[PDB]
Amino acid sequence: PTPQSTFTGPIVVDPITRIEGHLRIMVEVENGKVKDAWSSSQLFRGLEIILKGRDPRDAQHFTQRACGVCTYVHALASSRCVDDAVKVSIPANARMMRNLVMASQYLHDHLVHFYHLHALDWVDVTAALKADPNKAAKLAASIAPARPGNSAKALKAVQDKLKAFVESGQLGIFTNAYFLGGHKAYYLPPEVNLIATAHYLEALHMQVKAASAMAILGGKNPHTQFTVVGGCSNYQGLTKDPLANYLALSKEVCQFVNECYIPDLLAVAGFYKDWGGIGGTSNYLAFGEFATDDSSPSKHLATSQFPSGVITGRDLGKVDNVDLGAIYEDVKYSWYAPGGDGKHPYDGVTDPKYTKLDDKDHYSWMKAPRYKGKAMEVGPLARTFIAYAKGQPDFKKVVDMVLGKLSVPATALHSTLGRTAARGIETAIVCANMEKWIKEMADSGAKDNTLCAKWEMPEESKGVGLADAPRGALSHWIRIKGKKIDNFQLVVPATWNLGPRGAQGDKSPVEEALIGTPIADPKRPVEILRTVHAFDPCIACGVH
Amino acid sequence: AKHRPSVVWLHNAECTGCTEAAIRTIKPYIDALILDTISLDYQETIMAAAGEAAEAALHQALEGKDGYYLVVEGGLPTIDGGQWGMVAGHPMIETTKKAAAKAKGIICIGTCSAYGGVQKAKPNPSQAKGVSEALGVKTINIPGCPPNPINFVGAVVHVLTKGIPDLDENGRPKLFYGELVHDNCPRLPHFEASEFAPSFDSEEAKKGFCLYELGCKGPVTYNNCPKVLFNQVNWPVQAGHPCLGCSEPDFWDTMTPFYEQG
Numbered sequence: 001p002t003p004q005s006t007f008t009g010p011i012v013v014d015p016i017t018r019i020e021g022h023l024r025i026m027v028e029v030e031n032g033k034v035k036d037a038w039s040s041s042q043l044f045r046g047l048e049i050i051l052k053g054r055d056p057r058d059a060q061h062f063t064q065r066a067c068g069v070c071t072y073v074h075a076l077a078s079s080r081c082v083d084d085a086v087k088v089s090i091p092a093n094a095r096m097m098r099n100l101v102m103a104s105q106y107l108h109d110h111l112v113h114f115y116h117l118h119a120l121d122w123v124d125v126t127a128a129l130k131a132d133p134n135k136a137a138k139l140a141a142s143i144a145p146a147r148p149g150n151s152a153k154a155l156k157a158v159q160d161k162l163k164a165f166v167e168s169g170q171l172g173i174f175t176n177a178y179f180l181g182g183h184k185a186y187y188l189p190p191e192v193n194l195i196a197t198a199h200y201l202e203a204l205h206m207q208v209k210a211a212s213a214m215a216i217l218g219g220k221n222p223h224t225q226f227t228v229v230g231g232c233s234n235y236q237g238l239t240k241d242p243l244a245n246y247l248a249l250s251k252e253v254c255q256f257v258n259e260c261y262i263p264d265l266l267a268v269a270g271f272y273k274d275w276g277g278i279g280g281t282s283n284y285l286a287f288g289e290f291a292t293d294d295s296s297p298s299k300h301l302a303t304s305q306f307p308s309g310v311i312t313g314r315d316l317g318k319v320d321n322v323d324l325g326a327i328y329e330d331v332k333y334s335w336y337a338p339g340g341d342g343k344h345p346y347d348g349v350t351d352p353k354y355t356k357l358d359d360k361d362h363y364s365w366m367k368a369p370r371y372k373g374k375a376m377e378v379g380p381l382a383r384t385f386i387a388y389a390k391g392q393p394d395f396k397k398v399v400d401m402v403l404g405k406l407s408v409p410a411t412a413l414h415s416t417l418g419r420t421a422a423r424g425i426e427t428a429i430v431c432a433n434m435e436k437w438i439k440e441m442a443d444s445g446a447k448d449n450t451l452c453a454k455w456e457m458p459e460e461s462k463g464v465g466l467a468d469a470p471r472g473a474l475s476h477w478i479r480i481k482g483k484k485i486d487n488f489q490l491v492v493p494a495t496w497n498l499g500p501r502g503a504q505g506d507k508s509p510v511e512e513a514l515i516g517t518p519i520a521d522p523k524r525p526v527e528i529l530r531t532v533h534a535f536d537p538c539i540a541c542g543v544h
Numbered sequence: 545a546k547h548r549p550s551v552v553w554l555h556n557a558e559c560t561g562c563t564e565a566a567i568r569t570i571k572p573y574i575d576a577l578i579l580d581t582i583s584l585d586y587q588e589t590i591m592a593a594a595g596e597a598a599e600a601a602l603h604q605a606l607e608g609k610d611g612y613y614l615v616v617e618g619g620l621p622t623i624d625g626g627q628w629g630m631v632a633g634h635p636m637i638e639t640t641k642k643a644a645a646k647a648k649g650i651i652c653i654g655t656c657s658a659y660g661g662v663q664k665a666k667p668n669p670s671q672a673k674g675v676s677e678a679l680g681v682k683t684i685n686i687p688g689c690p691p692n693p694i695n696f697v698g699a700v701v702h703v704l705t706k707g708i709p710d711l712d713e714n715g716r717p718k719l720f721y722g723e724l725v726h727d728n729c730p731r732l733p734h735f736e737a738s739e740f741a742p743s744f745d746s747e748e749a750k751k752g753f754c755l756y757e758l759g760c761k762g763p764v765t766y767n768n769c770p771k772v773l774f775n776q777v778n779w780p781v782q783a784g785h786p787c788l789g790c791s792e793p794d795f796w797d798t799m800t801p802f803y804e805q806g
């Protein structure tokens with residue numbers, strides 16, 4: 001069965017590495033299982049405060065620096081938010097360009113997360129040295145598509161590289177890894193460790209290509225610079241040769257997704273099938289992404305090709321519409337002044353007030369977003385369940401492929417394994433849609449290169465920008481007064497998933513998901529990492 | 545087994561865009577860099593160890609017999625004894641001060657570590673400062689939000705193989721920051737002819753006219769963007785958008801409003 005110690009007592013993991021930003025996780029363990037948890041975000045910057053009084057046109061440039069991992073997405077949400085506030089409908093070409101840059105970001109972000117952030121929780125890199133490269137090549141032929149990168153010679157070259165590195169005595173990023181010397185919670189055969197490690201190295205190169213693709217439309221990566229109120233600035237991005245290069249690079253990236261990412265994900269999932277029984281939550285939310293109509297927040301919600309919705313208590317038979325009026329944020333268990341509970345983002349308040357480390361009454365810089373009083377998990381798994389429940393044909397097909405490959409029911413996806421699988425599932429789907437989306441904008445751009453609409457700054461208004469970023473439902477909310485920012489509030493996927501308890505004392509999704517976590521070795525609590533990383537945490541996003 | 549110079553990389557008040565930028569290097573790629581050239585001994589974004597095991601790895605590096613170079617990403621939040629930014633239960637300012645004391649050199653990657661960056665923008669609720677100000681020591685600054693990996697990796701390699709590069713008044717290597725964005729801009733002929741786009745929807749904008757009237761800060765920004773490009777493909781002005789002046793100290797406050805020159 002699943003390795004589990006008899007450990008009873010506290011475990012603190014700070015820093016949580018292989019995430020963006022600064023997270024401290026505290027748990028109480030009893031007989032080798034987590035019985036209580038706290039998600040404590042450890043940095044505050046205060047972008048909402050900084051924005052007050054500024055030019056609404058400036059917002060997107062400040063908010064994009066909420067995070068450089070999910071670069072672009074905040075510029076997009078801010079741009080959508082100001083477009084809404086000034087009541088401008090962006091030209092079709094701008095919708096297409098903005099949505100393709102989001103798609104390119106999914107591809108880059110998800111590849112890097114699986115390999116460079118998450119894989120080390122499941123893959124013992126040093127055990128790869130024990131593998132026979134010939135047996136590894138044979139195994140690779142049996143879990144993944146044929147490719148020269150998986151040949152015995154290629155895998156041997158990787159092993160030889162890793163061997164020289166380890167034997168140097170300078171382990172670098174692998175220093176003190178939880179897998180050193182072996183670990184009961186690490187299940188993979190050496191051959192699979194070697195295959196995954198080879199791909200990990202390949203993925204470091206392939207992510208450069210995914211970023212290049214993104215920058216053809218985005219201007220640069222990280223931190224794109226092509227969005228403006230009313231649309232986009234990048235006329236060259238509508239033209240033939242840039243788009244052919246965009247297509248070519250995207251195809252290389254997608255070949256890697258299909259040749260390496262999904263196959264490695266599925267192999268990991270098969271070996272760690274027990275993780276389908278760990279780390280589940282019950283409620284899911286998405287604002288949707290990849291809309292055919294982004295003229296308004298209402299139209300975004302309704303026409304998102306990755307649909308919006310709300311699932312409650314795992315009931316896939318009842319996907320509700322998103323009520324943007326029902327979102328609010330509590331600060332009862334957060335490092336903010338008293339009086340700030342129950343605030344809809346249009347009425348948001350950001351009044352920082354620190355107490356002390358591990359104050360169980362105030363233990364995080366994140367606010368606690370709630371939906372009609374319920375915590376909501378956001379991100380690939382939420383999108384995946386919502387799309388699946390709605391019978392979105394691409395999600396139905398791919399989810400069923402995964403379920404049939406692993407021989408597990410869809411209910412097994414309410415887990416850390418499912419959360420991890422969903423991320424791959426949607427990456428395959430974005431990939432399958434790239435060519436169609438590119439052709440649509442190429443044809444549209446060739447006929448008429450309108451890219452930015454005229455608009456007028458109102459004296460007083462409000463607006464909201466929605467996006468489903470790689471990590472989930474993102475919203476930016478502005479109040480304009482005297483043509484300046486009177487209030488600007490970010491409610492971010494990380495805030496939904498990793499914030500602290502709400503005003504009712506109710507655990508956030510990551511805190512709930514951590515309950516029941518087995519701990520095989522309290523000294524090296526990789527299981528905590530497996531679940532936390534599966535949520536793809538971004539603390540700079542979460543706190544801003 | 546040739547010894548590789550130890551590099552300790554700290555993350556303070558940052559967005560991780562500078563880490564992301566660094567791994568876009570292609571000369572060499574990041575794997576070749578950390579396998580062959582440096583020993584990257586602490587790096588929160590990608591390191592295997594977490595929690596106490598990670599903290600121990602940091603202290604091991606800091607105590608390494610051969611010494612180490614320090615890379616700092618992010619500004620330092622100093623309000624309330626530095627407690628608004630913490631790692632492992634220690635204020636970021638405390639850990640950075642400790643790491644810097646014995647560093648062979650300090651490279652600040654990004655405008656945040658160099659100059660204070662986005663969190664230092666008015667009204668600076670965390671009382672964030674740049675590293676040089678917070679520590680009272682000279683730093684090699686690789687600013688931009690984020691900097692080009694060409695500039696960061698080139699600096700690191702220069703430092704390990706040649707010495708400290710010549711720096712300008714703001715601590716930036718002249719190799720990469722010696723020229724104005726504007727002096728190398730393909731739209732310069734339009735600027736000279738007073739051919740400016742009045743809006744992003746205008747025919748002037750479609751025709752690639754100069755973006756100065758739309759707030760371009762190229763004329764006052766030191767960086768190599770139009771010469772080297774980003775991601776081997778593009779840069780902001782090529783994508784039709786004005787330069788924000790993101791490699792300039794305190795640009796959040798000196799270069800705003802971004803879409804004006806006022």
Ligand code: SF4
Nearest residue numbers: 559561654655656689
């Ligand atoms: S300089 Fe810019 S990209 Fe780098 S950490 Fe600071 S905000 Fe992020």
Ligand code: SF4
Nearest residue numbers: 726729754755760762
């Ligand atoms: S677009 Fe900017 S950098 Fe280029 S010529 Fe005009 S002002 Fe100078």
Ligand code: FCO
Nearest residue numbers: 070469470471494541
């Ligand atoms: N994806 C992403 Fe970043 C987070 N959490 C945002 O928005």
Ligand code: F3S
Nearest residue numbers: 767769787788789790
């Ligand atoms: S905004 Fe920054 S990246 Fe270059 S073009 Fe201007 S200095």
Ligand SMILES: [O-][O-]
Nearest residue numbers: 069070538541
């Ligand atoms: O990363 O958000």
Ligand SMILES: [Fe+2]
Nearest residue numbers: 489490491544
């Ligand atoms: Fe917020």
Ligand SMILES: [Mg+2]
Nearest residue numbers: 080083090294
């Ligand atoms: Mg819009």
Ligand SMILES: [Mg+2]
Nearest residue numbers: 175176177180
């Ligand atoms: Mg060790």
Ligand code: NI
Nearest residue numbers: 067070538541
């Ligand atoms: Ni982020």
